[PDB]
Scaffold this active site. Structure first.
Site, PDB file in Angstrom:
ATOM      1  CG  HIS B  72      -3.153   6.334   3.498  1.00  0.00           C
ATOM      2  ND1 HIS B  72      -2.741   5.030   3.341  1.00  0.00           N
ATOM      3  CD2 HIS B  72      -2.223   6.933   4.279  1.00  0.00           C
ATOM      4  CE1 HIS B  72      -1.613   4.844   4.002  1.00  0.00           C
ATOM      5  NE2 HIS B  72      -1.277   5.985   4.581  1.00  0.00           N
ATOM      6  CB  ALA B 272       1.647  -5.451  11.652  1.00  0.00           C
TER       7      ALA B 272
HETATM    8  C1  LIG Z   1       7.038   0.290   9.496  1.00  0.00           C
HETATM    9  C2  LIG Z   1       6.635   0.779   8.129  1.00  0.00           C
HETATM   10  C3  LIG Z   1       7.625   0.298   7.089  1.00  0.00           C
HETATM   11  C4  LIG Z   1       5.246   0.249   7.784  1.00  0.00           C
HETATM   12  N1  LIG Z   1       4.259   0.836   8.678  1.00  0.00           N
HETATM   13  C5  LIG Z   1       3.841   2.131   8.578  1.00  0.00           C
HETATM   14  O1  LIG Z   1       4.359   2.864   7.741  1.00  0.00           O
HETATM   15  N2  LIG Z   1       2.843   2.649   9.408  1.00  0.00           N
HETATM   16  C6  LIG Z   1       2.413   4.029   9.248  1.00  0.00           C
HETATM   17  C7  LIG Z   1       2.256   1.861  10.366  1.00  0.00           C
HETATM   18  O2  LIG Z   1       1.376   2.309  11.091  1.00  0.00           O
HETATM   19  C8  LIG Z   1       2.668   0.552  10.511  1.00  0.00           C
HETATM   20  N3  LIG Z   1       2.277  -0.467  11.365  1.00  0.00           N
HETATM   21  C9  LIG Z   1       3.029  -1.476  11.008  1.00  0.00           C
HETATM   22  N4  LIG Z   1       3.889  -1.187   9.977  1.00  0.00           N
HETATM   23  C10 LIG Z   1       3.655   0.124   9.650  1.00  0.00           C
HETATM   24 MG   LIG Z   2       1.150   9.827   4.251  1.00  0.00          MG
HETATM   25 ZN   LIG Z   3      -0.949   9.866   7.065  1.00  0.00          ZN
END
Ligand SMILES: CC(C)Cn1c(=O)n(C)c(=O)c2nc[nH]c21
Ligand SMILES: [Mg+2]
Ligand SMILES: [Zn+2]
Ligand SMILES: CC(C)Cn1c(=O)n(C)c(=O)c2nc[nH]c21
Ligand SMILES: [Mg+2]
Ligand SMILES: [Zn+2]
Lengths: 325, 325
Positions: B72, B272
């Site tokens: 971020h 992920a």
């Molecule tokens: C799925 C979510 C709970 C976690 N999450 C997320 O917020 N973003 C933005 C991702 O890019 C992401 N990739 C895996 N999990 C992710």
């Molecule tokens: Mg955000």
């Molecule tokens: Zn963002």
């Protein structure tokens, strides 16, 4: 936070509108930003669809084509353009002129001394330089500034006129060439006489009258240093004499004639400005004032003060000279 | 001549409109110029009388307000804004939305993660941070991003909205707030359902329909990394996990609950992203495609490729772990 230099502060953007602006406080990149601001502020970017990035590239290319002369350099360029910009506000030129005229006045102010070699037309002609030969002794320096101006604009990446239709381009080119060629001081009396003639009954709708008025406007901006505050104007005179003396020295050790006003042994800063302020500057701004009365208090006044200060300096100067005799 | 980096070349300007743009090649200084270009190019500077100098100060203050986090950060910010800019062209959004909405989309996109601390809402709430206490556990991060965005805009020097009548300000402010608060993933399912419900008979005339679409649009852009080319998208996953792991380690150390999806000992780039792509990304973009069919070839295609590439990559992982136990 505490923004970087090239990001003009609201205080700077405000001051940029008055002829009191301190042209010495800035570095090239900051001056380039000021010029950029001027095009957006005057509505030129908007009304002519100037690509904002191109405007930047163009200014940068223009900057790269100014030489490191003591006087005829990029900072003088910025001074003329900034004075023109001030004139637009002081005289409310946008109520008398079309945006096309404004674009012409501003772009010509910025391009009027491109690639100046540091030696005037008299030297070019007497020394039979390549420029004098190329332009047949007809205002070689000014013709050259123009040519460079348009070779620059010919480059697609710097062409701020890309989105102007062809008829508009031709109209702008003609206007710029006329203004840039008008800066040649050799034609000062000629141009002044014509303007004063038209001034007997000035017609804002007469195209020939406006052309002469624009020629006078750019001429006023080109030799307007003395209108600025004393602390800002003073150093410019030294830069000019540095350039003049350089030429006279060269003309002496080359057997070419030397103009008294550039002669190291005959001219003093004081006597130089006094005559130039009383017989060139004041008379010109005096006639312009008849058209724009507010010009008297904002520009004729500082010229009178400058005339008086230099006359005092001349006393003390001549005194010092006697002790050296 | 040879122009500085902050002066975008026409090649860059042309590539900036597509999701293929390589966000890793530029330094903050350059990315800021791109954002600036976007406002001029979409006609926002023009239609809202944004002082071009203010636009630059504002973009600079926004940049200074993004923290140096692995994910971020200012570059993610640029990615979101650049993906929004790409979608305006790809879907011809200017044919469906007013300029006021485009302004809302772009500005919300640039400000959506302002001053992100690097630890998600769950951490703020479980650790009872000042933010969580200040916002009463209600989307503390998103509320803070939005508050900081308007704090910046309240500084006259950065107020790119200074020349908009108050009725316009209120309309723009409310839209940005709605959009930035919509980026909290906790609300994903809820927002998706509402959108799909309206999607049963979308009406570009219904303001509630348009509000949801704008919410979906900024949601898409926010998590659009996997839409980008494999080599541009791949490194972002490492940045994300790096932040998630930093949080789980900290949570582990302070004795706070750890989320499985952030645990070092359980997450692999493949696990992920596979679930995220298959159940979050693809479904969301599929709905948007029903309104903008061109989205399928430009965005679903690469998501499908990323899904397959990561799934295959997991097999290689399982087969490798097997070969060891
Ligand atoms: C799925 C979510 C709970 C976690 N999450 C997320 O917020 N973003 C933005 C991702 O890019 C992401 N990739 C895996 N999990 C992710
Ligand atoms: Mg955000
Ligand atoms: Zn963002
Ligand atoms: C000699 C004259 C034509 C040139 N010239 C000039 O251009 N500026 C700006 C001066 O201040 C000046 N003072 C003397 N001559 C001057
Ligand atoms: Mg000259
Ligand atoms: Zn000059």
């Amino acid at each position: 936070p505490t923004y970087p230099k090239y990001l003009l502060s609201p205080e700077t953007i405000e001051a940029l509108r008055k002829p009191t602006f301190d042209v010495w406080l800035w570095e090239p990149n900051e001056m380039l930003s000021c010029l950029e601001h001027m095009y957006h502020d005057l509505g030129l970017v908007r009304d002519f669809s100037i690509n904002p990035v191109t405007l930047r590239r163009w200014l940068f290319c223009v900057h790269d084509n100014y030489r490191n002369n003591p006087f005829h350099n990029f900072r003088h360029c910025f001074c003329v353009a900034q004075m023109m910009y001030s004139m637009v506000w002081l005289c409310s030129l946008q109520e008398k002129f079309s945006q096309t005229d404004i674009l012409i006045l501003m772009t010509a102010a910025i391009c009027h001394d491109l690639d100046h070699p540091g030696y005037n037309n008299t030297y070019q002609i007497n020394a039979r330089t390549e420029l004098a030969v190329r332009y047949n002794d007809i205002s070689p320096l000014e013709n050259h500034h123009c040519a460079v101006a348009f070779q620059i604009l010919a480059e697609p990446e710097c062409n701020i006129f890309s989105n102007i239709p062809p008829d508009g381009f031709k109209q702008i080119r003609q206007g710029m060439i006329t203004l840039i060629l008008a800066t040649d001081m050799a034609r000062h009396a000629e141009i002044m006489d014509s303007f004063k003639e038209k001034m007997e009954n000035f017609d804002y709708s007469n195209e020939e009258h406006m052309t002469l008025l624009k020629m006078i406007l750019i001429k006023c901006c080109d030799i307007s240093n003395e209108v600025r505050p004393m602390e800002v104007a003073e150093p410019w005179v030294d830069c000019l004499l540095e350039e003049y003396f350089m030429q006279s020295d060269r003309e002496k050790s080359e057997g070419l004639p030397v103009a008294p006003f550039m002669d190291r042994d005959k001219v003093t800063k004081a006597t130089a400005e006094i005559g130039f302020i009383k017989f060139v500057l004041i008379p010109m701004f005096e006639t312009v004032t008849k058209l724009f009365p507010m010009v008297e208090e904002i520009m004729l006044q500082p010229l009178w003060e400058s005339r008086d200060r230099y006359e005092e300096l001349k006393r003390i100067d001549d005194a010092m000279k006697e002790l050296q005799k």
